[PDB]
Amino acid sequence: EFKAGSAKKGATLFKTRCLQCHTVEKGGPHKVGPNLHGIFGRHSGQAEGYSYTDANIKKNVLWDENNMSEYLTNPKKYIPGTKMAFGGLKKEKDRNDLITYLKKATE
Amino acid sequence: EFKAGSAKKGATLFKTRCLQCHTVEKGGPHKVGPNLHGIFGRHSGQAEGYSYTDANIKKNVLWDENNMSEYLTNPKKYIPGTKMAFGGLKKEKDRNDLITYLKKATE
Amino acid sequence: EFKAGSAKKGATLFKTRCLQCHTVEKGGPHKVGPNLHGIFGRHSGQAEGYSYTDANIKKNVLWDENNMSEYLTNPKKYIPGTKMAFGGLKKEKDRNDLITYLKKATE
Amino acid sequence: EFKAGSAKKGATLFKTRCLQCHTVEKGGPHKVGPNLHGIFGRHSGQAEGYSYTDANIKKNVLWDENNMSEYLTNPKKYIPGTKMAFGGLKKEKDRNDLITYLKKATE
Ligand code: HEC
Ligand code: HEC
Ligand code: HEC
Ligand code: HEC
């Protein structure tokens, strides 16, 4: 149940918590995790060049601001068996800010 | 088609041609290429902690002495689009010796 | 470092120093060396149908006018272990003229 | 292949990735690495008071914005056997920004 926030703060959140494993630019490299360009409006596990786990592809969730917020609260609880090593942004304002940035940075 | 050979000579072949990108010990580090412990009897692209290419995971070949010999003759021809930069041991005795060592060194 | 020059002179340079081992036309044959069509903007060792050395593929240099000039000064010094038997065009005006021609002849 | 960028950002890139081993001011001290004043337009290994490796002097590359960008992508791949312990700025924008600063800071 997403509500938009500060994209400037979300940039700092992404750079500190996600940038180590992910890239956002169109046609960026796949670090530990896959490139996230065009992640919104795309099924889970459909990034070319990345070897996803069975769980990530089987979830087949069409990413949007609402299910992304649920995913980022507890990645393991949302997709059990995900290789993404991340506890989760537990504050709702954090997820809202991060997703606000991620929406523009990946379109 | 594999035939066993000199494991002492295969160690020299591995150390000169593979050691720069690969490690064999149980729980070794992932250099340019992945750690090869337990490579035999395991699917291609199933080493933990390594980011494989799309081609290497898609091949899904269960490694054995025979398909490894074919792979090491021409890695690009066997798995088209592999990031492993290696032309290939073209002599059959070289592949047999290297695989003889690699079998013991990775079990 | 690269500066454009006489493409007419570069054609004479290519025909006298490179044409024996290389072809430039789209879909030309691989003589002693590989076909050079689309060499610019492509990684080193990515020509289809040619067996490159380990050194040429491992260099993985994205060819451009600047690194080509450095390569053509001393091919062995730039890519140690290259099977290309060529000392190198030591004059800068020579490399500039040759690359000026090679840019149009291979696009 | 160099294109100019942000010298303000390049100052931050140099201070975070290079300042530990290098100094830029005219007549600065040689830390782990040599002083880089007047590095552009000078041959590799010609800084007074510094003990370079055999590989760094043997490369004898006349430094410029283009070959520096290639060097900073992968120092070991460019000069094999360099004692400079640095993986390399893999983003092109980062090399462009750093070199833009380094050009003014070392002249
Ligand atoms: C490395 C330790 C990671 C950190 C920190 C973050 N992510 Fe992650 N991500 C990582 C991996 C290994 C994977 C693959 C998951 C699998 O099991 O296959 C992912 C995946 C994602 C996805 C899904 C993409 C898709 O299905 O197409 C998303 C949306 C994602 N990661 C987002 C994300 C964000 C926003 C992060 C910071 C809060 C973040 N990740 C951190 C590895 C790592
Ligand atoms: C670095 C330039 C390499 C050299 C030399 C050798 N290998 Fe390689 N290897 C390298 C990479 C980057 C990869 C990843 C491939 C990909 O596209 O994902 C590999 C992979 C392998 C594998 C497959 C492992 C698996 O699928 O689990 C094997 C079996 C392997 N390498 C073996 C091997 C041997 C025996 C070598 C010397 C003859 C050798 N490699 C050299 C990088 C490099
Ligand atoms: C035959 C004796 C050669 C002459 C004369 C020239 N080239 Fe060469 N070239 C030759 C070989 C055998 C190879 C393969 C190198 C290897 O080790 O795999 C090459 C390769 C090149 C490349 C690299 C192509 C790529 O990596 O895709 C280039 C750009 C190239 N050759 C250019 C070139 C030019 C411009 C020449 C005349 C000045 C020239 N070559 C001469 C063999 C021979
Ligand atoms: C210490 C761990 C280093 C870091 C981080 C960086 N550099 Fe480096 N540099 C270091 C050493 C030990 C050397 C000597 C190399 C040798 O083998 O002799 C160097 C050298 C250079 C050079 C070459 C200078 C010359 O040949 O005159 C350049 C241009 C250089 N270093 C640049 C540079 C930049 C821009 C860095 C940050 C991105 C950087 N270095 C980091 C040690 C270390």
Residue numbers in the entry:
A (entry chain D), B (entry chain B), C (entry chain A), D (entry chain C): -4 to -1, 1 to 103
Authors' text:
Water-soluble, anionic calix[n]arenes are useful receptors for protein recognition and assembly. Here, we describe the protein recognition and assembly activity of p-benzyl-sulfonato-calixarene (b-sclx8), an extended arm calixarene. A cocrystal structure of p-benzyl-sulfonato-calixarene (b-sclx8) and cytochrome c (cyt c) revealed a surprising assembly. A pseudorotaxane comprising a stack of three b-sclx8 molecules threaded by polyethylene glycol (PEG) was bound to the protein.
The crystal structure was solved by molecular replacement in space group C121, with four cyt c molecules in the asymmetric unit. The presence of b-sclx8 was evident in the unbiased electron density maps, and a stack of three b-sclx8 was modeled. A tube of electron density running through the center of the calixarene stack was modeled as PEG (vide infra), resulting from the use of PEG as the precipitant. The trimeric stack is ∼6.6 kDa (approximately half the mass of cyt c), ∼2.1 nm long and held together via CH−π and π–π interactions. As a consequence of the stacking and the projections of the extended arms, the b-sclx8 trimer presents four hydrophobic grooves. Each groove accommodates the N-terminal α-helix of one cyt c by binding the methyl substituents of Thr8 and Thr12. The side chain of Thr8 is flanked by Lys4, Lys5, and Lys11 each of which interacts with a sulfonate ion. The Thr12 side chain is flanked by Lys11 and Arg13, the latter forms a cation−π bond to b-sclx8. Surprisingly, the crystal structure included a PEG fragment of 29 monomers (1.3 kDa) threaded through the cavity of the trimeric b-sclx8 stack, resulting in apseudorotaxane. The polyether chain forms multiple van der Waals contacts with all 24 of the phenolic hydroxyls.
